[PDB]
Symmetry: C2
Subunit: 381 residues, 2 copies
C-alpha cells in the first residue's frame, strides 16, 4: 500500500522514540534479572508485549526503558524506602546488561546527540527513566548518582505519595500538589539536567510543576482528560500550561485511559487523543508513550511493540502531515531532552548552588577540638 | 639542594599516585557534604591533613579518594546494611562534586589512559575506591553500578566481617578467610575490571584471594609485618604470593603500623618499609598508600599531603635508582589498573557469565498463567 510505504519511509528517516516501556520489570518477574543463556527467550518471549525480534519488526527508533520498582509496602517505612533504592540499582543494572549483551540491536543513549548516532547506526536508542521519587530513598545525592548511571527522566510519583509530590490515584491528598521539598527539587532537577515527568502525578502537582519548571517537562505516558475522564489523564488547563512550558504529552496506550469500557479501546482512540492535543496545543507538543509491559493487554491494533507502523500509517491516513507525524514520532521528545540539557549547562555555567541532603552530625565537639589543635600544631612546623 | 631538584624533576616527569586518602570523609565530618561557598576553606582547611593548596604544594600526580562509610552499628542488620549503601552514594556524590567544582586542580580518572591525560594537563588524577564490602549491601548489582559511578577498587573489608570476607582487627574469625560467596565475588571483580584491595583483610583472606585472583591486586594502605608485627601489615608469605599475583603493596604512613611506639614513627620508617619490600619482591611491586585523613597525626616528616617531595628525596638519598623511585611513585599502580582492565576485556570478550543476585519471586503462578495465555492470544492474531 502507498501509505504503508510512506510510514515505513518515515520510520527509517527519523527515530520513533517511545516514552515508557516496562520490559525491564518483566525480566525481573520472569527471569529474576538472570539473562545468562536466555537469548532465545529475549528474542522470542513467552510472555509480555516486548521482545528483541518484535522490537526490530516495529521499526522503533528509540526507547526510554523504565527502571520502575514498586511503592514500598513494609510496615517499617525506613526499610521499605531503603529497599526501593537497592531494587532501583538492580533494575538499572539489568537494563545496562540487556543493552551490553545485545549491541547489534540496542545502544545506550543519554542525550539528543547520542540518540541520533544510535539511530544512524541502525540501533534502538536505549534511554532510562525511573518511575517515582520513592525510588531515591529521600536522597538528592542518590538522585544525582542515578543521573550519572544514565537516568534521564524521573517520574515525580508512581501510585503512592512521597515527600516531594502527590500521586493521582491515591486519596486523600497529602501535600495538595508539590511539597516545599518538591518545589526545591524542581530547581535541582532543572540544574542537573534531569527531565521532569508528570505522569502518575495529581492535577494540582502538574499545575504547580508546570509553572515552576525552568526547563520543558514531559508526560511519559498520559492521555487526554476531555476525551476520557481519569485521574491519570491531562486536563485542558494543564495542556495549556504544558504549551507555555514547551513540554510534550506522550500519549498512552492504556485501555482504561482511552475508553470507559476497556475492551472497546483501539488504535483509532490513540489517534483521536494525538489529534486532539495536536489540534489544540500544536503537533510540536505531542508524542508517543505506549506503556507497553505496564499492562496485560493493549488496544485493538496496538497489541505489542511490532504495531508502531500501523500507528504511523493511521496518523497519515487521518490527514496529519509528514512533518507533524515526524514530530509526534520523536523530534519533539529529542527537542525537550536537548532543551533540558541546554538549561542545565546554562545554570551550571552560571554557578548555581546544588541541593544538599540533611546529613547527621558524625563528630562531637571533642573530636573537632582534637582536629583543630592538631592543625595548629602542623601550622607551627 | 641537588637531590631536592632531582625529586622535583621526578614529580613533574611521572605522577605520584597515592593509594588511599580519606579527605571525602573529613568533608562529611566538617561540612556535612555541603561545600557551597566553602572554597576558601577547601583550599585552606581548619582541620585534617588534606586541602587543595597543600595538595598542589606536595606535587601529587594522582589520588584514589576513599568513599568510605563506617561499618553499620544498627541492632537491625537489614537497616544498617541498607543505610551503608545510601551513605556510599552520598560519599560518591561529594567526591564527584569536589572534582567538578575544582577542575583546574582535580580531574576525574578511571583508567591508565585517563590518569596520564590528567597528568599531562597538570591536574591531580582523581580516582575512587570504596573501603569495605559492607558498603554494597550484599548486592552485586549495586557493586556493578558503583563501577559505573567511577569506583575502581574495592577493599574487601574494613574493620568488620561481611558475607564475603574476614577483617584483620576483629576476632573471632567468621569465615577463616574468604566465604564461598567471597570466592565467587573474586571472579566477578576480575570480570568487571574492579581492582581488588587487600588492606584491612585478614592474613588468611589475603592468601586465598592472592591464589584465586586472575588479575593483579593491591594493598591500598598496608605496611610490612617483619619490620612491625600488626594484623593490618603484610606477611612475608603474602608478599611472595603478591609477587606471583603481579600486585603492588602501597606502603602506609599509619604510625601504629610503622613502630611499636606510635610517637617514634618517622619518614625514615616509611622508607625502611619501601626498601624492605623493594629488595625482597622487587621495586615493580611497591607503591605509596599514605592513608592521610584516616589518622589524627602522621609520622615526623610526613605530617600532611605537602610532604611527598621529602619522601621522593629520601628514597633517592638511600640509593634507590630513579627508575625504581618512579615505579614506587606511580608507574606500578598504573600498570596494575592497566592489567586489571586488560583481564576484564579478555574475560568479557570471551563471553564469561556475570554473577547475579538472589532475587525474590515477585509473581505467583496465577500472574504467570495470565501472561502466557495473553501471549498465545497475540500469536493467533
Ligand atoms: Cl541531525
Ligand atoms: Cl487548552
Ligand atoms: Cl502486569
Ligand atoms: Cl605514556
Ligand atoms: Cl618473601
Ligand atoms: Cl579521625
Ligand atoms: Zn512503568
Ligand atoms: Zn505508569
Ligand atoms: Zn580509609
Ligand atoms: Zn583503612
Amino acid at each position: 500500500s502507498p501509505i504503508e510505504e510512506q510510514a515505513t519511509r518515515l520510520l527509517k528517516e527519523v527515530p520513533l522514540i517511545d516514552g515508557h516501556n516496562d520490559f525491564p520489570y518483566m525480566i525481573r518477574g520472569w527471569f529474576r534479572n538472570d539473562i545468562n543463556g536466555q537469548d532465545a527467550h529475549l528474542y522470542d518471549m513467552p510472555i509480555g508485549q516486548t521482545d528483541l525480534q518484535r522490537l526490530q519488526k516495529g521499526l522503533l527508533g528509540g526507547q526510554f526503558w523504565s527502571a520502575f520498582v514498586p511503592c514500598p509496602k513494609n510496615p517499617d517505612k525506613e526499610v521499605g524506602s531503603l529497599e526501593a533504592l537497592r531494587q532501583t540499582l538492580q533494575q538499572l543494572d539489568v537494563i545496562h546488561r540487556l543493552i551490553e549483551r545485545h549491541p547489534t540491536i540496542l545502544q545506550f543513549a543519554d542525550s539528543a546527540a547520542s540518540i541520533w548516532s544510535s539511530f544512524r547506526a541502525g540501533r534502538v536508542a536505549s534511554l532510562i527513566g525511573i518511575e517515582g521519587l520513592h525510588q531515591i530513598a529521600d536522597s538528592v545525592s542518590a538522585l544525582r548518582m542515578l543521573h550519572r548511571l544514565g537516568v534521564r527522566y524521573v517520574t515525580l510519583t508512581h501510585n503512592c505519595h512521597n515527600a516531594f509530590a502527590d500521586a493521582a490515584t491515591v486519596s486523600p491528598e497529602l501535600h495538595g500538589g508539590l511539597s516545599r521539598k518538591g518545589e526545591r527539587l524542581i530547581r535541582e532537577l532543572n540544574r542537573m539536567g534531569m527531565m521532569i515527568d508528570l505522569s502518575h502525578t495529581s492535577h494540582e502537582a502538574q499545575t504547580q510543576a508546570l509553572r515552576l519548571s525552568r526547563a520543558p517537562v514531559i508526560y511519559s505516558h498520559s492521555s487526554i482528560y476531555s476525551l476520557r475522564a481519569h485521574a491519570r489523564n491531562v486536563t485542558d488547563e494543564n495542556l495549556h500550561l504544558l504549551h507555555r512550558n514547551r513540554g510534550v504529552v506522550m500519549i498512552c496506550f492504556l485501555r482504561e485511559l482511552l475508553a470507559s469500557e476497556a475492551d472497546q479501546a483501539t488504535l483509532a482512540h490513540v489517534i483521536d487523543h494525538i489529534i486532539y492535543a495536536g489540534t489544540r496545543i500544536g503537533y510540536e507538543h505531542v508524542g508517543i508513550g505506549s506503556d507497553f509491559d505496564g499492562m496485560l493487554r493493549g488496544p485493538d491494533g496496538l497489541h505489542d511493540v511490532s504495531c508502531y507502523p500501523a500507528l504511523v500509517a493511521g496518523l497519515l491516513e487521518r490527514g496529519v502531515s509528514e512533518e507533524d507525524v515526524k514530530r509526534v514520532m520523536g523530534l519533539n521528545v529529542i527537542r525537550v531532552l536537548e532543551e533540558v540539557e541546554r538549561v542545565a549547562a546554562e545554570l551550571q555555567g552560571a554557578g548555581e548552588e546544588c541541593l544538599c541532603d540533611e546529613l547527621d552530625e558524625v563528630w562531637n565537639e571533642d573530636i573537632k577540638e582534637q582536629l583543630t589543635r592538631e592543625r595548629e600544631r602542623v601550622r607551627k612546623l
